[PDB]
Design a protein around this ligand. Structure first.
Ligand code: BCL
Ligand code: BCL
Ligand code: BCL
Ligand code: BCL
Ligand SMILES: C/C=C1/c2cc3[nH]c4c(c3C)C(=O)[C@H](C(=O)OC)c4c3nc(cc4[nH]c(cc(n2)[C@@H]1C)c(C(C)=O)c4C)[C@@H](C)[C@@H]3CCC(=O)OC/C=C(\C)CCC[C@H](C)CCC[C@H](C)CCCC(C)C
Ligand SMILES: C/C=C1\c2cc3[nH]c4c(c3C)C(=O)[C@H](C(=O)OC)c4c3nc(cc4[nH]c(cc(n2)[C@@H]1C)c(C(C)=O)c4C)[C@@H](C)[C@@H]3CCC(=O)OC/C=C(\C)CCC[C@H](C)CCC[C@H](C)CCCC(C)C
Ligand SMILES: COC1=C(OC)C(=O)C(C/C=C(\C)CC/C=C(\C)CC/C=C(\C)CC/C=C(\C)CC/C=C(\C)CC/C=C(\C)CC/C=C(\C)CC/C=C(\C)CC/C=C(\C)CCC=C(C)C)=C(C)C1=O
Ligand SMILES: COC(C)(C)C(=O)C/C=C(\C)CC/C=C(\C)CC/C=C(\C)CCCC/C(C)=C/CCC(C)CC/C=C(\C)CCC=C(C)C
Ligand SMILES: CCCCCCCCCCCC[N+](C)(C)[O-]
Ligand SMILES: CCCCCCCCCCCC[N+](C)(C)[O-]
Ligand SMILES: [Fe+3]
Lengths: 240, 302, 281
């Protein structure tokens, strides 16, 4: 009968769908590799999917995945054991070298554009009309690090025009240079902004950006990488 | 301690945004409404603009007609007094025509003519909103995903008040419009078909409905967990993978042995959800047309 | 065994217990102290279910079922064959679940991300503990828990509901359902948005968050935004399970009569309690 025809068909459909559904989720990171870079013997049971191509909003091009995968950077790590499976120790300073929770990917060194071709993220100073509407305004507050010492002061708020959203605080250091610090990693309080991930002495190390009114995808990654990494690597100076 | 990103800790306002144009008839968008600072802590503060247009107004007008049609009835059931209307709100109910009238449109209003009227209005209201769903995407040159997914919901609905009644021989099979009464109809439906817990589709629907809650928790918590690297910016993470997406994949790979991509997860999401009403509608459609009793069927298997 | 970008992430550190002892992978699996804990509790639990399978007289997975001690034992121990096995298994489950959550937290510290995932998983663990631990306890016997089998576990759902008439009327249960239906609706919508921007009409170029916001404003006059929809998903979901636990912890303990009658409070307000007419007078 019908019902049992229907339910039996359904399971076959479902298995095709999982098959689908999995190969589609292979467009990045595959083929698997060995701790050295060479392709792994078992790639498992699902084949790699046929390639597909995105175009690329503003003359920016094309992307095709699956495609040759490569870190386009040196990785400073060394094995700690003679067999597959263990941690790879950092061979220098993981915050600088960009490994572990401090990693970044080599994304494109252009900034994201909104729907009209304009830089998605501008500092507030250059964003006409943008003002703070609710919540304490950080501009002006001193910035404190996880070692309870003062690293700098906020001088602007870099915002996402199209999403109308704060994305970074720009921060001025002892020497008069600035840094970006992610909104998501700071705590705005009433008489100051607080940063748990970094200690005072690590602010100078935050990657700088090249032009002072835009950030690239590559630089957002180095900045965010560098500061998440502090949670692990700055623990010795973090106190409470 | 650390911020968690559930509410914004600072809002930021700029000019109302009138959105993209692509091929859209700008003549049909309203003005931008106010800015809610309330909404503004969770997501975007901007209300409006909306885009009305023939189909939107068609839809919306029927929408109310169905709504009010039921509402007249309730008023009548109360015998017109407010105190009563409020008192028994959840107890009123507008019920389909009695079995006696089959599939005809001949039943008196009080014997179900109203029911048909309201249904009619809901029918046009819904499909008109469906098309609007497609049209609104064509103008922006977007894929038709939202329309395809909305069809799945429409499926269940269509099965419950239209298809199954047609195949059974009478509108009396359809759902009555009422808060407590549609609840009762539901309970009743399972009892008379031998307990829906025996319906293999019914229980596959549960799986997807539980599934969706589990997947959205998974997803949403993941995007919050990597929003300190820009995670919510999913389309650009699709075009140019960043450490947000890498750490997201790897948390899951290290946890349960496999993972997804930024575009792949959305594919899992759109299907987990869509299958809730798809199997669910087969589930109901085979009930009492082909299977009278899920207990019995399950002993045989046909 | 490694995604093309994985190596730089596999560094030492983050473990909550054991220092470097269990800091390694096995294939794609991170292990950790809790990796070990969950295997222990899982294996154990599995063995006890198998054992339980022999006393029952089946290997059929569609019939195997482990019942809680009968009511007569109240909150006390019980002989293996009559519900002690369920009792131990339940200790084992909790062991496995909680271990998994903390294993998650360790994966979190190593990767430098936030703790949102383990935290959401904790709401699930709490739904389970409500049914097998908290409700039973406020009620006076493991016997009110539910049993471990595919179908028997459904029967408990059905009987326990019907003990209060049509469970549809539990008010916290209506809320909970709401969130489930809503969370599912949002999931279809999010999946459909991102994909239709990523996959636009044949030949056009990738759309943008901006189109996403536009699309929604055009359609319903509002758009919550890319960060908000993720905040919302998380919330609808966790809220549903929260209300589920709630609707159950009150049933059988502070309300033991039929859920339908509970609505009489509304109907018996002095302002309308007598007025003739309507449905209830
Ligand atoms: C699924 C199988 C049963 C069924 C089983 C259940 C069960 C069980 C429950 C509900 C519940 C609800 N059901 Mg029902 N429901 C069915 C089909 C429907 C249909 C339909 C058009 O097919 C509709 C509109 C509803 C409507 C509703 C809502 C009143 C309520 C919460 C819905 C929700 O969260 O939506 C999702 C979220 C949205 C944002 C969509 C829009 C929300 C608004 C509220 C839609 C409501 C319009 C409404 C009728 C106006 C009410 C009158 C006012 C009170 C003045 N049901 C079928 C027949 N439904 C719950 C409840 O509380 O009932 C009291 C509940 O526990
Ligand atoms: C939540 C309210 C009730 C309940 C009400 C219902 C109803 C009603 C139904 C189910 C159904 C299911 N329930 Mg139940 N269920 C409950 C508690 C649980 C618990 C538990 C430890 O708390 C577990 C493991 C299950 C497991 C299951 C699945 C066997 C089945 C489909 C689940 C699904 O898709 O989930 C969504 C999760 C995913 C998609 C993730 C994948 C999870 C997999 C599928 C888990 C299978 C585990 C295995 C069978 C049991 C353990 C194996 C041993 C540990 C080795 N239920 C509580 C008591 N449950 C459905 C069914 O069809 O049953 C026959 C159904 O109709
Ligand atoms: C006690 C009675 C029976 C029972 C009887 C039924 C019946 C009967 C049905 C379900 C159905 C379902 N039940 Mg059951 N169910 C039982 C026990 C359970 C249990 C449980 C723990 O016991 C669970 C978890 C479920 C879960 C479920 C779902 C998986 C499924 C509903 C899908 C859905 O999202 O519909 C909600 C979505 C919709 C109704 C579609 C909405 C479509 C339209 C287009 C929306 C229009 C809005 C309108 C225009 C107005 C707008 C509002 C205003 C603008 C505000 N049932 C018991 C055993 N159940 C449904 C199913 O599919 O079964 C196969 C169904 O028909
Ligand atoms: C005829 C029966 C009654 C009824 C009686 C009950 C009863 C009784 C209960 C519910 C509960 C629920 N019902 Mg009701 N309900 C009815 C009709 C409905 C209808 C409907 C459409 O009519 C709907 C939509 C629902 C909906 C719901 C949900 C609100 C809630 C279930 C989800 C939940 O708790 O998840 C919570 C999720 C979990 C508990 C899962 C936890 C998983 C654990 C932590 C991890 C699993 C690991 C596992 C072993 C995996 C290993 C697998 C492999 C090793 C990998 N009910 C009818 C009227 N309903 C339940 C509830 O509220 O429970 C708290 C409940 O007990
Ligand atoms: C897995 C599949 C899931 C799923 C999926 C999807 N679901 C979608 C889409 C997708 C993909 C869309 O794209 C579409 C949409 O656009 O989203 C924004 C939609 C929709 N899902 C709605 C409701 C819904 N989905 C449910 C279920 C699931 N969906 C399941 C779980 C349920 C349940 C659970 O019962 C409900 C109630 C509508 C909101 C919307 C169409 C409304 C419509 O066609 O309206 C027609 C328009 C009107 C009828 C106007 C009427 C005015 C009302 C009646 C009342 C008046 C106003 C108010 C009370 C006060 C003022 C009155 C005053 C003057 C006195
Ligand atoms: C909070 C809101 C939602 C939510 C959220 C999240 N959910 C998560 C996470 C988050 C965030 C994770 O991070 C985590 C995960 O990694 O996902 C891949 C997880 C997980 N959610 C699972 C199942 C699941 N989630 C459900 C519900 C929701 N989740 C809701 C809807 C449901 C429902 C609806 O029933 C189910 C069945 C497992 C897949 C996985 C745990 C594996 C485990 O802990 O391994 C450890 C345990 C084992 C490997 C087996 C041990 C078995 C014992 C010892 C022997 C069996 C005992 C048992 C009682 C037998 C009963 C049988 C049965 C017939 C009665
Ligand atoms: C956007 O970003 C995102 C990603 O990536 C970019 C992701 O991938 C994911 C993850 C989501 C998916 C990949 C989609 C599919 C997932 C589901 C449908 C959810 C259901 C999951 C399952 C049913 C699989 C469950 C398997 C589990 C929990 C473990 C299986 C366990 C074993 C086989 C062994 C257990 C290991 C132990 C005991 C521990 C240590 C090991 C030893 C041997 C010791 C999300 C959410 C995401 O949002
Ligand atoms: C306050 O007073 C006023 C007057 C302002 C009011 O307006 C108050 C109004 C109310 C009190 C309103 C209350 C409204 C409700 C609570 C409604 C509740 C509705 C439900 C719970 C509905 C649930 C399910 C309905 C379903 C499944 C219907 C589906 C319908 C169809 C598929 C339609 C099929 C079409 C038919 C039969 C007609 C076809 C005819 C043709 C010619 C093709
Ligand atoms: C797209 C996600 C795939 C997940 C599917 C989960 C399978 C659930 C098992 C349901 C079994 C119940 N029954 C009676 C229908 O067999
Ligand atoms: C709810 C359905 C669960 C589906 C689980 C599918 C498992 C597929 C495993 C993918 C293989 C990973 N590898 C080995 C490719 O990395
Ligand atoms: Fe997303």
């Amino acid at each position: 009968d019908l019902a049992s025809l229907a339910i039996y068909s359904f399971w076959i459909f479902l298995a095709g769908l999982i098959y689908y559904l999995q190969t589609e989720n292979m467009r990045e990171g595959y083929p698997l590799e060995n701790e050295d870079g060479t392709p792994a013997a078992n790639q498992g049971p699902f084949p790699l999917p046929k390639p597909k191509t995105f175009i690329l909003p503003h003359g920016r091009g094309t992307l095709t995945v699956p495609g040759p995968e490569s870190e386009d950077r040196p990785i400073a790590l060394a094995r700690t054991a003679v067999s597959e499976g263990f941690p790879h120790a950092p061979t220098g300073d993981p915050m600088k070298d960009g490994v572990g929770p401090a990693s970044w990917v080599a994304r494109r060194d252009l900034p994201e554009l909104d729907g009209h071709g304009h830089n998605k993220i501008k500092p507030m100073k250059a964003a006409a009309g943008f003002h703070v509407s609710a919540g304490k305004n950080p501009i002006g507050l001193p910035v404190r690090g996880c070692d309870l010492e003062i690293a700098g002061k906020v001088v602007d708020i870099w915002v996402d025009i199209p999403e109308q959203m704060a994305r970074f605080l720009e921060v001025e250091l002892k020497d008069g240079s600035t840094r970006l610090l992610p909104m998501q990693m700071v705590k705005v309080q009433s008489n100051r902004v607080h940063v748990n991930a970094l200690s005072s002495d690590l602010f100078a190390g935050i990657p700088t950006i090249k032009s002072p009114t835009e950030v690239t995808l590559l630089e957002e990654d180095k900045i965010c990488g560098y500061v998440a990494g502090g949670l692990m690597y700055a623990a010795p100076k973090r106190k409470s | 301690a650390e911020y968690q990103n559930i509410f914004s800790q600072v809002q930021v306002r700029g000019p109302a945004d009138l959105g993209m144009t692509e091929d859209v008839n700008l003549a049909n968008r309203s003005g931008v409404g106010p800015f809610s600072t309330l909404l503004g802590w969770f997501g975007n503060a901007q209300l409006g603009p909306i885009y009305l247009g023939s189909l939107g107004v068609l839809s919306l007008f029927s929408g109310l007609m169905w709504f009010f049609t039921i509402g007249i009835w309730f008023w009548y059931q109360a015998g017109w007094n407010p105190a009563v209307f409020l008192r028994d709100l959840f107890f009123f109910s507008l019920e389909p025509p009695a079995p006696e009238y089959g599939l005809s449109f001949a039943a008196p209003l009080k014997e179900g003519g109203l029911w048909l009227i309201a249904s009619f209005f809901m029918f046009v209201a819904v499909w008109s909103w469906w098309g609007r769903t497609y049209l609104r995407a064509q103008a922006l040159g977007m894929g038709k995903h939202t329309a395809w997914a909305f069809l799945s919901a429409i499926w269940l609905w269509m099965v419950l008040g239209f298809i199954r009644p047609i195949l059974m021989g009478s509108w009396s099979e359809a759902v009555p419009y009422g808060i407590f009464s549609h609840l009762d109809w539901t309970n009743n439906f399972s009892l008379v078909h031998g307990n829906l817990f025996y319906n293999p589709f019914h229980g596959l629907s549960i799986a997807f409905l539980y599934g969706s809650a589990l997947l959205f928790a998974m997803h949403g918590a993941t995007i919050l967990a990597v929003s300190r690297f820009g995670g919510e910016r999913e389309l650009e993470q699709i075009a140019d993978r960043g450490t947000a997406a890498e750490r997201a994949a790897l948390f899951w790979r290290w946890t349960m042995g496999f993972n997804a991509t930024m575009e792949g997860i959305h594919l899992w999401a759109i299907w987990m959800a869509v299958l809730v009403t798809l199997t669910g509608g087969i589930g109901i459609l085979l009930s009492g047309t082909v299977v009278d009793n899920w207990y019995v069927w399950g002993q045989n298997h046909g | 065994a490694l995604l093309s970008f994985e190596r730089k992430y596999r560094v030492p550190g983050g473990t909550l217990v054991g220092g470097n002892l269990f800091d390694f992978w096995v294939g794609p699996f991170y292990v950790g102290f809790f990796g070990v804990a969950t295997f222990f509790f899982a294996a154990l639990g599995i063995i006890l279910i198998a054992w339980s399978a022999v006393l029952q007289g089946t290997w059929n997975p569609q019939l195997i079922s482990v019942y809680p001690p009968a009511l007569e034992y109240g909150l006390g121990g019980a002989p293996l064959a009559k519900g002690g096995l369920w009792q131990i298994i339940t200790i084992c489950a909790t062991g496995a679940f909680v271990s998994w959550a903390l294993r998650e937290v360790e994966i979190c510290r190593k990767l430098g991300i936030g703790y949102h995932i383990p935290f959401a998983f904790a709401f699930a663990i709490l739904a389970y503990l409500t049914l097998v631990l908290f409700r039973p306890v406020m009620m006076g016997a493991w016997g009110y828990a539910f049993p471990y089998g595919i179908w028997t576990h459904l029967d408990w759902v059905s009987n326990t509901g019907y003990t209060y008439g049509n469970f549809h009327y539990n008010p916290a249960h209506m809320i909970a359902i709401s969130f489930f239906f809503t969370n599912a609706l949002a999931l279809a919508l999010h999946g459909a948005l991102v994909l239709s921007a990523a996959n636009p009409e044949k030949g056009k170029e990738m759309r943008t968050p901006d189109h996403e916001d536009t699309f929604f404003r055009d359609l319903v006059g509002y758009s919550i935004g890319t960060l908000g929809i993720h905040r919302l998903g998380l919330l609808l979901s966790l809220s549903a399970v929260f209300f589920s636990a709630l609707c159950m912890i009150i049933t059988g303990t502070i309300w033991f009569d039929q859920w339908v009658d509970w609505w009489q409070w509304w109907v018996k307000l002095p302002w309308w309690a007598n007025i003739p007419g309507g449905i209830n007078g």
